[PDB]
Ligand binder design. Structure first.
Ligand SMILES: Nc1ncnc2c1ncn2[C@@H]1O[C@H](COP(=O)(O)OP(=O)(O)O)[C@@H](O)[C@H]1O
Lengths: 76, 57, 77, 364, 44
């Protein structure tokens, strides 16, 4: 299942060599992440967006979470 | 009934995640990434995505 | 010939009556029935579970690069 | 085992092959001939042995039954003389030529149930059985026998009648052509007895040259292609370019005064008559069957010739099973032995219920 | 060539059976795998 999902992600991003490299790479808290995101937003500033992000984070909890936030922060 | 409620919750969560991505900045790529993140690590996935983007360029 | 090869395969899997029954079963199975990316996916699962063995398998596949045979092997696995 | 043995009978234009389903080879093979004085009727080898005092009949001369009275005698002979079984006690799988008239299929069915009282029967196309024997359900079969040759495209087990081609050029014509060129060489093979000798020379020393002209040049400037053949009286004769000139007629019928396309061109034409979506499957699965496809070198020659006719991007593969001389019979033995085929037999009950025409629905 | 294929087969999972299977493949693949599994079940 996970391997199939990784192959689908590689296809969306784009071949076989790239998929093999991705497989090799794969083979190779929440509050802190939120604070880091706010600090990154401050560096970018801006302030209004940070307030909106705090409201959005609360909404997600109302409707694992740390891993998704970390990936988004890395993309920046 | 219960299945329909679960589908609505998933759609609402996806919309909220997309808004967060836009602020820190597609939807199909985000859905694939979210499923992979739920299974299991996060830093490694980000590195692979960055490498794939460089290859596309 | 192809028919002779099928009989030889049945004998290896397996007195004369028993061999005939095995051949009939193989023929029935064939009637009922009537690549590189897949190998990489198997390697990724092995790496998650080991890593050295997965690297050797990838190297062997590269050396080989038949395809049909590989596919069959994968299926068997 | 609860079931009695089922019979498999391959009706050939020149030779009939009979045996029991499940076996690897037919138990008997005999000439498709019936003879009466110039014991009242002679069938098979005996008719041939005593042809001197008989008038011979060939009821299935070109693959299609033309005289049912004598065909019935061949079947009687098959059961009681060759296989030594009672037809009313065993299901019978019979083979038929490609493009066999619908009325003939009903006749065969009626004769089995009403004359021989078979408990069950079925009829399958010869080419289809050969394809089955090769482990395939899709492909094109080039069947070359004694009195006729056919190119039969088959997809998912079904022969495609619109694309089937018949070539009235086979083993018999090649035997007579060899008699003719050996006679032109300086020998003399003209009598019926001599025809049998040449047929033997043909089956033992002939071959298909990869390149006709080059082979002719080699034979003209050296004795490297010559082979000796000893007659029963001790005389040893020499066969040279006749070895490959004989079967060359399959590729160039003009050598026989025929305007027909050679076997390679006929195979190509059949494929071209099929839906474009399955042509690549046919090109990649061209199977040879029949005694006349036994010539050494024929597979490589077909590969070369088809490749020249087909698109350069086409993958061409000629399959020549070592046992292709009896692949029709073997395919029947395999089919009749299949678990899923048992429900396909036409039972005496079904025959009594629907009559002869049921064969069209049951044996599509 | 044949030896390399045998090593790959061992990692995925005798030698005579592999050689016979390779010859059959040279002479679809999914159907052959199903037949081998059925034969193993019959032997059991
Ligand atoms: N090894 C061989 N080489 C060439 N021709 C052969 C060989 N063996 C048999 N034949 C020829 O094949 C023909 C019979 O083949 P077969 O498929 O049994 O025909 P049919 O079914 O029409 O009677 C005869 O003409 C015979 O001479």
């Amino acid at each position: 299942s996970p391997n199939v999902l990784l192959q689908n992600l590689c296809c969306r991003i784009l071949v076989a060599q790239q998929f093999q490299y991705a497989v090799r790479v794969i083979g190779s808290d929440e509050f802190l992440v939120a604070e880091k995101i706010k600090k990154e937003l401050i560096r970018q500033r801006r302030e209004a967006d940070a307030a909106l992000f705090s409201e959005l984070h609360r909404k997600l909890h109302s409707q694992n979470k740390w891993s998704i936030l970390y990936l988004l922060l890395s993309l920046s | 009934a219960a299945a329909a409620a679960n589908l609505n919750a998933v759609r609402e969560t996806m919309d909220v995640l997309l808004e967060i991505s836009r602020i820190l900045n597609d939807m199909e790529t985000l859905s694939i990434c979210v499923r992979l993140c739920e299974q299991g690590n996060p830093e490694a996935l980000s590195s692979v995505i960055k490498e794939l983007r460089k290859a596309t360029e | 010939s192809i028919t002779q090869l099928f009989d030889d395969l049945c004998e290896a899997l397996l007195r004369k009556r028993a061999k005939r029954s095995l051949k009939k079963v193989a023929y029935n199975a064939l009637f009922t029935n009537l690549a590189r990316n897949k190998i990489l996916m198997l390697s990724f699962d092995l790496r998650v579970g080991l890593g050295p063995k997965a690297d050797r398998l990838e190297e062997l596949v590269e050396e080989l690069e038949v395809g049909s045979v590989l596919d069959l092997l994968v299926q068997l696995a | 085992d609860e079931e009695v043995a089922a019979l498999v009978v391959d009706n050939g234009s020149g030779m009939c092959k009979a045996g029991f389903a499940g076996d690897d080879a037919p138990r008997a093979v005999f000439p498709s001939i019936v003879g009466r004085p110039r014991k009242d009727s002679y069938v098979g080898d005996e008719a041939q042995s005593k042809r001197g005092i008989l008038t011979l009949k060939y009821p299935i001369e070109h693959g299609i039954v033309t005289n049912w009275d004598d065909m019935e005698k061949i079947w009687h002979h098959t059961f009681y003389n060759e296989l030594r079984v009672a037809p009313e006690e065993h299901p019978v799988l019979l083979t038929e030529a490609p493009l066999n008239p619908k009325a003939n299929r009903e006749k065969m069915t009626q004769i089995m149930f009403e004359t021989f009282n078979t408990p069950a029967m079925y009829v399958a196309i010869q080419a289809v059985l050969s394809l089955y024997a090769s482990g395939r359900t899709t492909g094109i079969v080039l069947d070359s026998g004694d009195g006729v040759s056919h190119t039969v495209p088959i997809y998912e087990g079904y022969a495609l009648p619109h694309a089937i081609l018949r070539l009235d050029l086979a083993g018999r014509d090649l035997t007579d052509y060899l008699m003719k060129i050996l006679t032109e060489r300086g020998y003399s093979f003209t009598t019926t007895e001599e025809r049998e000798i040449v047929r033997d020379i043909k089956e033992k020393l002939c071959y298909v040259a990869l390149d006709f002209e080059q082979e002719m040049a080699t034979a003209a400037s050296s004795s490297s292609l010559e082979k000796s053949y000893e007659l029963k009286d001790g005389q040893v004769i020499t066969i040279g370019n006749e070895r490959f000139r004989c079967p060359e007629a399959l590729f160039q019928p003009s050598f026989l005064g025929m305007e027909a396309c050679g076997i390679h061109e006929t195979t190509y034409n059949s494929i071209m008559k099929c839906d474009v979506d399955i042509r690549k499957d046919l090109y990649a699965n061209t199977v040879l069957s029949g005694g006349t496809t036994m010539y050494p070198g024929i597979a490589d020659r077909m590969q070369k010739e088809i490749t020249a006719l087909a698109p350069s991007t086409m993958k061409i593969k000629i399959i020549a099973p070592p046992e292709r001389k009896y692949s029709v019979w073997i395919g029947g033995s395999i089919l009749a032995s299949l678990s899923t085929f048992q429900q396909m037999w036409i039972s005496k009950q079904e025959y009594d219920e629907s009559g002869p025409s049921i064969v069209h629905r049951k044996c599509f």
